[PDB]
């Protein structure tokens, strides 16, 4: 969750960054946070699957597993939302820049 919120913050900042060097630094930090997010996703995937398998015979363990599942699902939803919003915003900016008369020919 913490990493997802950091990704959202970098998304918002990269929309406004005009210094090319800072934008590059933001892109690389973004790459680091995205990579960490994917790795946590894979780890939780395997660990939760193993916990649900381990809880088959104990209603309390099953309950724990299902709670983890719910929370992980909420995390996934949050990720999806962030991603969608950012895509939609990147579209409006890509519209902004070129919908006007342009610098003199090549």
Partner 1 sequence: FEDLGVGGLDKEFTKIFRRAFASRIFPPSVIEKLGISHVKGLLLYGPPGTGKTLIARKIGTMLNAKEPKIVNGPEILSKYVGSSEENIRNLFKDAEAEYRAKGEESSLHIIIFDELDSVFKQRGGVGDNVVNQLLAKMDGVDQLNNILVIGMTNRKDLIDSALLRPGRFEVQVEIHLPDEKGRLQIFDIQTKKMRENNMMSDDVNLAELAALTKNFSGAEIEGLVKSASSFAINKTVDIAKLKVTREDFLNALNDVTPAFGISEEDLKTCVEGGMMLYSERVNSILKNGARYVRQVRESDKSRLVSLLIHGPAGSGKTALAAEIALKSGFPFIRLISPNELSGMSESAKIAYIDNTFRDAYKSPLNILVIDSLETLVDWVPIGPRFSNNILQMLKVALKRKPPQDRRLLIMTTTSAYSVLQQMDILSCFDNEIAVPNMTNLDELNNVMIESNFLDDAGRVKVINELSRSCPNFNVGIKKTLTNIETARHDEDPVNELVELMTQSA
SS (H, E, C) 29-62: HHHHHHHHHHHHHHHHHHHHHHHHHHCCCCHHHH
Q: Which residues of 63-76 are buried (b: 16+ CB within 10 A; e: fewer)?
A: eebeebeeeeeebe
Beta carbon of residue 76, minimum distance to partner 1 (angstroms, whole number)? 6
Instruction: Output 31 or 58, the one with its CB closest to partner 1.
Output: 31
Instruction: Output 38 or 67, the one with its CB closest to partner 1.
Output: 38
Residue written as token pair 């309390």: 60
Site for partner 1 in 59-88 (CB under 8 A): 73, 76-77, 80
Q: Per CB under 8 A, does 90 bind partner 1?
A: yes
SS3 78: helix
SS3 82: helix
Site string for partner 1, 11-50 (x = CB under 8 A): ---------x---x--xx-xxx-xxxxxx--xx--x--x-
User: Could you list the residues that contact partner 1 (CB under 8 A)?
Assistant: 20, 24, 27-28, 30-32, 34-39, 42-43, 46, 49, 73, 76-77, 80, 90, 94, 98-99
């Amino acid at each position: 969750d913490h990493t997802i919120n950091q990704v959202d913050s970098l998304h918002k900042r990269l929309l406004t960054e005009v210094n090319e060097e800072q934008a590059s630094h933001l892109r690389h930090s973004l790459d680091n946070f995205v990579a960490q997010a994917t790795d946590l996703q894979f780890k939780l995937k395997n660990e939760i699957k193993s916990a649900q398998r381990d809880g088959i015979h104990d209603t309390n363990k099953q309950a724990q597993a299902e709670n983890s599942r719910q929370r992980f699902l909420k995390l996934i939803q949050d990720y999806r939302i962030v991603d969608s919003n950012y895509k939609e915003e990147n579209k409006e900016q890509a519209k902004r820049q070129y919908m006007i008369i342009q610098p003199e020919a090549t």
